[model samples]
Target: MDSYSITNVKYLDPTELHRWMQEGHTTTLREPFQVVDVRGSDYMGGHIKDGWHYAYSRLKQDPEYLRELKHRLLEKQADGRGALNVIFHCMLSQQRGPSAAMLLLRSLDTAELSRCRLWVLRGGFSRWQSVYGDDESVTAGYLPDLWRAAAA
Candidate 1:
C-alpha cells in the first residue's frame, strides 16, 4: 500500500530559497536542484530564474504531463550527482502547490523516490515576489506594471 501525503513535501521559506540561489545551486548543471512554478494564468508578472513551469491545469487534464515530469526528474538524477531538490509553488502554497508536489511524488518509484526531495514553497510566488522580485539575478521577466495592476 502506497500513500501520497503532504507530509512527504517539506515547506521551504523564501529566504532559504534565496540562500540556495545565492549558493549557486542554479548556476551549475551538475546540481540536481530546480524550482517548479505551477501557476496558470496568474503566472504573469515574474518568476524565479531557471524555474520550470508545469501548470496545475495541465497536470490535472493530461496524464502524460506527469510522465514527462517523471522523465525530467529521472534524467536529472541519472547523472548520479546528488539527490533531486524539486521545489514546487503556485500563486499561494495552499492547494495547487502541494497538489503538484504530491502528484510528482506519487508518480515516482522507489528508485526515483529515494533520490528526490520534494519541497513546497512556504508562501508561494506571492511571497517570493515580495522579496526577490526586484532581484534580476534570481528572478526573470519581472514587470512592475503587471504587479502594480493589482492596486489599480
Candidate 2:
C-alpha cells in the first residue's frame, strides 16, 4: 500500500480548489479528488458539480450515515485506488466541514484511513460564491455559484 497517511486534517481555499478543477480538465495526469459538501438541503440551491452532500449533523446523529461514508471511502480504496484525496466544505467552511472530517477520520481505523488525504475548504461555500460565482454552468466539472450571502 502507499506510505502516505493522513496524520492531520488539511485546509484548502476556493482559489486552490478552482485551480485544481481546471487542472483536472486541462490534463489527464492531474490528481483526481472527491469533493464533499456538508451543507445539507441547501445543496439543491447550489454546490460543486462533483460534490457529495453528507451533512455534518447527519454524521453526528445518524449511525447509518457514518457507516455509509466509511463504506464508500474504504470501498474505493479496496478497489485499488490508493489513498483518496477528499476536499470537504460547508456554508462557511468552518465547524460543520471540519467536524465531519474529524468525525469520519476518527471513526476509521488507521488501516482503513492510512491512505486517505483530507482537506477542509478554508472559506467554504461562501468563498466559493465570491470567487467562482454560482450556477450549473460552472464551466468546469465542479458546480459554480456567485451567490455569496456574506463574507468570511
Candidate 3:
C-alpha cells in the first residue's frame, strides 16, 4: 500500500459487462470477477445483481470496512490463482466509484497487485439501469418508477 495512480485504473462499459455476465451464466468462470457498489444510502434504489455494497461514506470513516473489502476481493488471488476482476461504481461512475476503486488499489500489497484488476464501471449504475434495469438477470430490486420520478 505504498503507491497510488489513477493511470492504473481502467473502465469497463456496461455492454461488455452485460456480455460478461451473460457468459458467466452459461459457462464456468475462467476469469473470476466481483462488482462493488459504493453509492451510500442511494443504493436502496437498485443495484447490479450479485454486487457487493460498501457505501463510500463508510469506507471513508471505517478502515476495517475497507480492509475487509480488500480481503474479500483478493481472497482467491491469494492462492496464486487467476486474477480477480474488481469493478467499482456509483451513480455515474464519476467520483465515488472511481475513487473507491482507487482506495482499494492504494491499499493493495505490491505482491498482490497482479492478482487483481481494478476497474470503474464506465457510466455507473445510472447508465447501467437505463439499459438493464428491467432485466432481472442483470439488476436487482430495480424500481423503474423511482428512477422516473427522480428524473422528473
- Worst lDDT window (10 residues) for model 1? 24-33
Q: Residue by residue across 21-97, what tens digits does model 2's lDDT show? A: 76652123354567878877666546676667798788889989988987887666566545676788888746778
Q: Top lDDT: which candidate number? A: 3
Tens-place lDDT digits, model 1, residues 1-152: 13466777888899888888888663334456788888998898899999888898998789998788778877876775677788999887578888888888888877567777888889888889888889999999988777774676
Q: Each candidate: RMSD to true structure?
A: 3.3, 4.9, 3.2
* Steric clash pairs (candidate 2): 48-143, 49-142, 49-143, 133-145, 133-146, 134-144, 134-145, 134-146, 135-144
Residue-wise lDDT of candidate 3 within 1-152, one digit each (tens)? 22468877888889988887987621235677789999988887789999999998998889999999988877755664377888899888578777898888888888877778887898889999999999999999998888894585
lDDT of each: 0.81, 0.69, 0.83
Candidate 3 residue runs with Cα over 4 Å from true position: 1-3, 25-29, 78-81, 149-152
- After TM-score superposition, what is the CA distance of residue 7 in candidate 2 from its true location, in Å? 6.8
Residue pair clashes in candidate 1: none
Candidate order by decreasing lDDT: 3, 1, 2
The TM-score of predicted model 3 comes to 0.88
Q: In model 2, what is the error at residue 52, expressed in angstroms?
A: 0.3
Off by over 4 Å in 2: 1-7, 25-30, 134-152
Task: Choose 1 or 2, whichever is better by TM-score.
Answer: 1
